[PDB]
Design a protein around this nucleic acid. Structure first.
Lengths: 116, 154, 122, 57
RNA sequence: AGGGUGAAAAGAACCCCCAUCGGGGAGUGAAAUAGAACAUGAAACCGUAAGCUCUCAAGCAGUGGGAGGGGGACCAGACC
RNA sequence: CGGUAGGGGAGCGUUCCGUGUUAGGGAGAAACGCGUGCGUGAGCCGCGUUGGACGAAGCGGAAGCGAGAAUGUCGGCUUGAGUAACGCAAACAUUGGUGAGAAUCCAAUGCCCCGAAAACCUAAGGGUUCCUCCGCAAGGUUCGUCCACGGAGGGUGAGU
RNA sequence: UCGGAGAGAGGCUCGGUGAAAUAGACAUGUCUGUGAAGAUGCGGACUACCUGCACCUGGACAGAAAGACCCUAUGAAGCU
RNA sequence: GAAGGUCACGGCGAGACGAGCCGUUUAUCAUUACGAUAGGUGUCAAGUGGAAGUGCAGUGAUGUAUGCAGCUGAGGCAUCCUAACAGACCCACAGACUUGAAC
C-alpha cells in the first residue's frame, strides 16, 4: 500500500477518471440515487461534497471552476439554489452510502449513493 | 485501558497502575522494585547524561521487495536490454548439482522488524513531561514503540 | 433415498460447482435456503430450485412435513462432454471439454430421540 | 516452461482441494434485523421511513 | 464417425417445482433399477457413506514377524 | 531337478464343425462376487446377485489361439487445471423499459475514438448472412428477454 | 557508473467460460562413499511437523527433436 | 453456553492473496476507563500564483489599482454532520492414571 494513499486511480488513466466522475456527479444531483461499485462510491463521494461546499459560498468564484467539472448548465444552478442551501446548517455529510446484495452474475462490490 | 484490551488490565491490578500498550522487561542493573511505590520514571537517575543511547525501532515495509532493492547493485538495460534492468540479474547455474545455494540474495518480502541503531549522542533531555532528542537516525517511522535501551557498548 | 429430484445437462461445471452442495449437506431445509441466497456463486442455480424441488413435492406426494427435512445425500457427477475446437497455433494442442453436471440429492425426516425427565415434589 | 515427469494425479491433487473449503455465506452474522420476518443474510437496508423504495405510501 | 427400448410402443393425459428447458409422482408394460443419452451394459476415470491406519515421520514402500481397533465366532478352546 | 538363445517331451482355454432338434435352460446363457475347495500351471466345478438369451459336457478334426510396451492403430477417459488464456491499451457509467436474471440488449442524457477514415458506393468472391415476428440446448473461448445462431414468413418490378 | 519515482497493459484476489508440451508407478530430503564408476529411491550418517499461495528458478544427464556433427551399412539423391 | 477467538463494518507511513496494527455512533462495566481508525468540513501551513468581475489609461495589444487575490492532492490541528447498528456464530460446564513431597 502507498504510504498515505487516497482517491483510487481505478484501472484507467487520470484523464479517464475526471471524465467518468463527471457522470455519477450530475446524475446524483439530478435524480437522487445512483448505483455503483463501493470504490466508485467512496471516490465520487468527495468529488460530490467538494462541489456542494462551493455552492454554499455562492459568488462566481465557485462557479467558473465548478463548471470545469460538470458541463450540464441545468444541474449547476441546482447547487447554487436547491439542496446545498438545505445543508446550510450541516457542516458536512452531504452524501450517504450503503452496501447491498452482490451483482448479477458478477462478484462485487455494489452500493447505492444518495443525499442525506 | 478500556477499549480493546480487557484481560491485560484485570491481570495488572497486582500493585500498580495505568497500563501501557506492551509491557517490556529488562535485566539486572540494581534498581527499585514493587515494594516502595512501583513506578519507573524517564530520568533513570543512574544511566548518567551526556552518554550515547541506542534506539531500537521497527523497520518499515516495501511489500514483496525484490533483490535489486535489498542490495542495490545490478546492471541492466531497458530500452533494448532483455534483462529490463529491474530483473534480479538472473542468478543460478545451468548444469550443476549443488543445492541452489540457499540464503543467497533474492526478492522475498519485507515488514516490521527490530532495527537498533546504537550509539548516537544526545543534545537535550527532559523529564516529567517525557521527551527526548536523538541525533537523527531513529529507526522506523514515527508510530512504533522503540526500546530506547541505555547502551550495550560493552 | 425418499425423494430424489433435480435434472441433468446443466450448463455449469463439476469443479466450480459441488463446492456449494458440500456445505448444505447435513443441513435442514431452512439452513440450506438461508445460505444459498447469500452465496455469490453461480452454482446457486439451478441448485436453488433444487432444494425446493426435492421439497414441496415430498409434502403432497408423500407423508413428509416441511420441517425435520435434511439433505441426506448430495453429489455432483460429470455427464456428457463436447469436444470443441479452438484455433491457437497450427491447431494441435487442443481437445476441449465441457464438464457438465447432473447432481441428484434426496431429502428425508430426522431421527433423534429426546425425553427429558425430572422430579417436582409439591 | 519445463515439463513434469511422473504425474501422481491421485492423492496430491486431492489434498490441494482443502483450501477451497465450502465458504458458507462469506459474511458476518447480520441475522434478523428485527421486524424483518427473515431478510437476506448479509446486511441490508435498515428499518425506518420508506427509503430505497421506488414508490412511496 | 455413427448398429438393435419392447412382441405390438399402449414411446408417458393429468398433477407438482421451474423461465409453459429439467426432474419427481400418478399410469401403461412381465420388465422404464427397458421409455426416445433407451437392450445385456465390465474396465480406465470421477464421487458419497461406513470400519481401520494416518503430524515428530521420510526413500518404486511390498513382504515376513506383528500390538491395538471397528465387526462376525464357538454354550473358553485364542480363528475369518 | 538355477537357467538365457535353442532343442526335445506333455497339456488348458477360445470360435466353429462332425458325433447331438440327446441332453441342460424362461422353476432362465451373458456380466460381476463368493465357496479362497481343486490341478504342476494357464484354469475348472458349484453357487448368490444382476440380467437377458441359448449355449453346450466327452474325444477327434479345422483354426484369422488369448500382447502391460514395436515414438503401434481406433475410441473413451485422467493429470499439469480449473495455472494460463478469454486475442492492439479508440475507459466507462447512469436514469428507465422488458425479462426469472442483463456492466455488455433496447430507449434517453453524455463521455471517448476515427474523420480521405474502423463513411458510403461498386467489381471479384461470397451468395441469401439483407427485413420482420419468435425461440435459444448447440454456435457466440461471461450472461444474454441481444445476434450475421436456430425455427417460420416477407423481399431483389429498368426499351435507356 | 548506484539508479529511483510515477503513469498505463499483465502479474495478485474474486465472479463466468475455460487449454497444452508431458507422464511406467509414487509416502520424488541433504551429504559422503559406492555403483557399465557426477542417482532422492543402494550403504552409513545427518537433518527434517502435515498441507497451500506468490516468487526466484541450479537437480530430475527436465520438455520438443529415433541430431542437420563423426562413423558404420559394397544405401539413396544431385553435381563435377 | 464465559474468558477469548473469529466474521463483518470504517481504515492503516502493514500486505500479491492471508497475516499483523487501531477503531466499530455511552467513540464496550466502575472509577475520566484518555476511547474521531477513514471520507467530508473549518482553520492553518505549504505549493502555484497576483485569476474572475469591475474601474481607469491607450486606436489596439497591453498594463495598472483592489490582488501578494483566488485556487488548492495525500501535510498539521480541529470537527465524528455521513458510514462504523442493537445482535450471532465458533469456543464450554474447575478438567486422566501412578508415585513423591504436604494436609
Amino acid at each position: 500500500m502507498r504510504h498515505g494513499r487516497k482517491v483510487p486511480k481505478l484501472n484507467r488513466p487520470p484523464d479517464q477518471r475526471r471524465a467518468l466522475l463527471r457522470g455519477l456527479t450530475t446524475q446524483l444531483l439530478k435524480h437522487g440515487r445512483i448505483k455503483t461499485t463501493k470504490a466508485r462510491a467512496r471516490a465520487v463521494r468527495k468529488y460530490v461534497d467538494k462541489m456542494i461546499t462551493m455552492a454554499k459560498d455562492g459568488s462566481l468564484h465557485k462557479r467558473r471552476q465548478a463548471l470545469g467539472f460538470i458541463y450540464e448548465k441545468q444541474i449547476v444552478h441546482a447547487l447554487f439554489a436547491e439542496v446545498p442551501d438545505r445543508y446550510g446548517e450541516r457542516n458536512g455529510g452531504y452524501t450517504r452510502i450503503i452496501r447491498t446484495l452482490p451483482r448479477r452474475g458478477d462478484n462485487a462490490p455494489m452500493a447505492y449513493i444518495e443525499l442525506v | 485501558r478500556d477499549r480493546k484490551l480487557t484481560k491485560p488490565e484485570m491481570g495488572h491490578l497486582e500493585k500498580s497502575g495505568i497500563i501501557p500498550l506492551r509491557h517490556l522487561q529488562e535485566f539486572r542493573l540494581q534498581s527499585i522494585d514493587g515494594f516502595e511505590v512501583t513506578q519507573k520514571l524517564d530520568f533513570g537517575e543512574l544511566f548518567k547524561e551526556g552518554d550515547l543511547v541506542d534506539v531500537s525501532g521497527t523497520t518499515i515495509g516495501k511489500g514483496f521487495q525484490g533483490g535489486i532493492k535489498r542490495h542495490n547493485f545490478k546492471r541492466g538495460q531497458m530500452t533494448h536490454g532483455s534483462k529490463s534492468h529491474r530483473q534480479l540479474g538472473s542468478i543460478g547455474a545451468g548444469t550443476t548439482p549443488g543445492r541452489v545455494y540457499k540464503g543467497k540474495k533474492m526478492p522475498g518480502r519485507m515488514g516490521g522488524t527490530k532495527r537498533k541503531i546504537r550509539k548516537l549522542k544526545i543534545v537535550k533531555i527532559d523529564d516529567q513531561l517525557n521527551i527526548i532528542m536523538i541525533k537523527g537516525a531513529l529507526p522506523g517511522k514515527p508510530g512504533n514503540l522503540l526500546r530506547i535501551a541505555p547502551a550495550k557498548i560493552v | 433415498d425418499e425423494i430424489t429430484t433435480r435434472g441433468y445437462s446443466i450448463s455449469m461445471s463439476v469443479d466450480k460447482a459441488r463446492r456449494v452442495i458440500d456445505q448444505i449437506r447435513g443441513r435442514s431445509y431452512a439452513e440450506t435456503l438461508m445460505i444459498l441466497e447469500l452465496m455469490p456463486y453461480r452454482a446457486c442455480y439451478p441448485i436453488f430450485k433444487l432444494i425446493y424441488s426435492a421439497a414441496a413435492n415430498a409434502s403432497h406426494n408423500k407423508q413428509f412435513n416441511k420441517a425435520n427435512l435434511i439433505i441426506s445425500k448430495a453429489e455432483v457427477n460429470k455427464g456428457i462432454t463436447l469436444k470443441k475446437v479452438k484455433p491457437r497455433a497450427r491447431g494441435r494442442s487442443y481437445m476441449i471439454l465441457r464438464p457438465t453436471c447432473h447432481i441428484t440429492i434426496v431429502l428425508r425426516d430426522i431421527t433423534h430421540f429426546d425425553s427429558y425427565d425430572k422430579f417436582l415434589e409439591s | 516452461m519445463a515439463v513434469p515427469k511422473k504425474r501422481t494425479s491421485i492423492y496430491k491433487k486431492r489434498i490441494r482441494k482443502n483450501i477451497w473449503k465450502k465458504k458458507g455465506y462469506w459474511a458476518a452474522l447480520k441475522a434478523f434485523s428485527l421486524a424483518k420476518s427473515l431478510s437476506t443474510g448479509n446486511s441490508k437496508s435498515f428499518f425506518v421511513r420508506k427509503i430505497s423504495n421506488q414508490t412511496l405510501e
